[PDB]
């Protein structure tokens, strides 16, 4: 039976940087999750670029993305970021969070199929209103940290409603750190700075394959200044280092 | 097809007094560059680099039941302390857990092992001398060029195995991840032999960088365990100077 507990030993990592946020860490073998804040762990926020994980799976499952070697060609038209003005592989597009590449994937998938897959995946509030290519950036789609770790555990076990081949392709594209004892798969997200009363959200979600154990994690925090952005990885990294998972 | 000799990497070898070869191919195994044409095609014991085909064969035959198979340690002494623990497939590959792969090979058996090495065009395909040590001590031999051809087939999912099984092994071979590139690689060491008949050390793999791919295979004569670090530092310095990694 799945369980969750609230911890306090991680609060010092948040208050030291004056951050309002939540970390959820689940140990696969014990089906046990721990968090610094049960209420915020259940609160649903815009997934932003973390939506690229289900978007990639749906793109492959629908055939919009032909295979793992698919190249997304840049047509030479100006893009919002210098980093996106080039041909990208699936891993390249995921690594730099290339919004235009995923906007085009979502358009070819279409609203009917996108809605079907988000329901099969139990992904957040499953609300894709506001436009087929912006409902995850600044739309109505919301997902909690607890829902993110449930979704990533399904992906890890190849239990999503998609071919094992397509789940394996996305799992390898999400590798961000490799060491002899562990492999980190992760994805960042940032909705924007919002306002002082309504700050934006920053995410870091993923999982760590350490020896024979697997740890699923989801971090989110309020962000009103782009200088705080490095904290989306430093806070969860410091917590997982103190737990002996990475480092 | 062609192999072209590149004298600009000799410095990395002579600075360390190493007798070895580096083979580097961009996009495909059609055009490879090397410091030594003769040694690039010379066949050597694969040692732990054989864990790559052994893992694919184990998955294809069902000996390795699935992606998340745990290889339990029975508690009996193993030749290295890092092998005395339960291991995932990636864990067994990354610490080169010989006894895990010896038991996989025994269960695959000589007939199936021969069939797959023929399908994979894996070196001289000689598995004689003992099903649990042919790649460590006997007559199996493969060249640096044949290693890059085999890894290119794996990269393209063109080996005679399911795409699922090739994807499982490719993920188990990831050894370095950066925003710009992903390195898949495997080390090998036959032992020290003698000053006159040295052992061999390997480093083989590929680098997925932006939209480009680079296949590499390194081997060197080795008669002292103190020289093992060179099997990664020499090819690493060559690929860093080529702007592929670092
Ligand atoms: C996914 O997380 C994409 C993020 N793009 C950048 C922003 O959302 C910030 C806008 O200035
Ligand atoms: C993988 O290449 C493992 C190598 N181990 C060392 C030997 O096989 C020789 C001495 O045990
Ligand atoms: Cl991002
Ligand atoms: Cl080795």
* Euclidean distance between CA atoms B5 and B144, whole angstroms: 14
CA distances from B17 to A107, A235, B142, B222, B224 (A): 58, 46, 24, 11, 13
Q: Within chain A, how many helices (H) and strands (E) appear?
A: 9, 7
Tokens 């099903």 belong to B131
- Token pair 């860490």: residue: A25
Q: Which residues of B153-183 are buried (b: 16+ CB within 10 A; e: fewer)?
A: bbbebebebebbbbbbbbbbbbbbbeeebbb
The sheet with strand A182-190 has its strands ordered as A3-6, A32-35, A21-27, A213-223, A200-210, A182-190, A175-179
Residue found under tokens 């095609």: B41
Q: Whole-angstrom Cα distance, residue A197 to residue B50?
A: 59
Helix pair A99-109, A111-120: axis angle to 10 deg: 100
Declared resolution, Å: 1.9
Is the beta carbon of A189 within 6 A of some atom in ligand 1? Answer: yes
Task: Give the containing element (helix H, strand E) for B26.
Answer: strand B20-26
H or E segment at A15? Answer: helix A11-15
Q: Can you say whether residue A242 is alpha, beta or left, with left for phi > 0 and alpha for psi between -120 and 50 degrees?
A: alpha
Element (H, E) at A204: strand A200-210
Whole-angstrom CA distances from B105 to B74, B92, B186 are: 18, 14, 18
Considering all CA atoms of chain A, what is the largest pairwise distance in Å, rounded to the nearest integer? Answer: 52
CA distance A187 to chain B (A): 12
Closest by CA position to B43, among listed B108, B113, B134, B122: B122
Task: Tell me which residue in A87, A180, A181 faces B211 most closely, judged by beta carbons.
Answer: A87
Number of residues assigned to chain A: 247
Q: Which residues surround ligand 4, an ion (CB under 5 A)?
A: B 48, 96, 187
Nearest CA in chain A to B86: A212
State which H helix or E strand residue A236 sits in.
helix A231-242
Numbers of helices and strands, H then E, in chain B: 9, 7
C-alpha distance from A174 to closest chain B C-alpha (Å): 10
Long-range contacts of A131-137 (CB under 8 A, 24+ apart): A132/A106, A132/A107, A133/A103, A133/A104, A133/A106, A133/A107, A134/A103, A136/A46, A136/A47, A136/A48, A136/A51, A136/A55, A137/A46, A137/A48, A137/A99, A137/A191
CB contact (8 A) between residue B175 and residue A175:
no
Q: Which of A172, A184, A185, A187 would best serve as a mutation to test chain B binding (most B beta carbons within 10 A)?
A: A172
- Cβ pair A175:B176 closer than 8 A: no
The conformation of residue B79, written as its DSSP 8-state character, comes to S
In the numeric block, which tokens belong to residue B68?
A: 């998340």
Sketch out chain A's domains with CATH numbers: 3-243 (3.40.710.10)
Considering only CB atoms, A183 lies closest to which of B90, B167, B170, namely B90
Concatenated DSSP letters of B166-181: HHHHHHHTEEEE-SSE
Min Cα separation B88/chain A (Å): 6
């Amino acid at each position: 039976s799945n369980s969750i507990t609230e911890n306090t030993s991680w609060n010092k990592e948040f208050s030291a940087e004056a951050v309002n946020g939540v970390f959820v860490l689940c140990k696969s073998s014990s089906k046990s999750c721990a968090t610094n804040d049960l209420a915020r762990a259940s609160k649903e926020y815009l997934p932003a670029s973390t939506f690229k994980i289900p978007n990639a799976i749906i793109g492959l499952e629908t055939g919009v993305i032909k295979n793992e070697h698919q190249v997304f060609k840049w047509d030479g038209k100006p893009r919002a970021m210098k980093q996106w003005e080039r041909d990208l592989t699936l891993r390249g597009a995921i690594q730099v969070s290339a919004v235009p590449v995923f906007q085009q994937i979502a358009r070819e998938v279409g609203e009917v199929r996108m809605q079907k897959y988000l329901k099969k995946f139990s992904y957040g509030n499953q609300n894709i209103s506001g436009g087929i290519d912006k409902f995850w950036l600044e739309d109505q789609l919301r997902i909690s940290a607890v829902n993110q770790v449930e979704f990533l555990e399904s992906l890890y076990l190849n239990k999503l409603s998609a071919s094992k081949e397509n789940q394996l392709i996305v799992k390898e594209a999400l590798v961000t750190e490799a060491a002899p004892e562990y492999l980190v798969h992760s994805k960042t997200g940032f909705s924007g700075v919002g306002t002082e009363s309504n700050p934006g959200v920053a995410w870091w979600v993923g999982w760590v394959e350490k020896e024979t154990e697997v740890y699923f994690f989801a971090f989110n925090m309020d962000i009103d200044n782009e200088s705080k952005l490095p904290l989306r990885k430093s806070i969860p990294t410091k917590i997982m280092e103190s737990e002996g998972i990475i480092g």
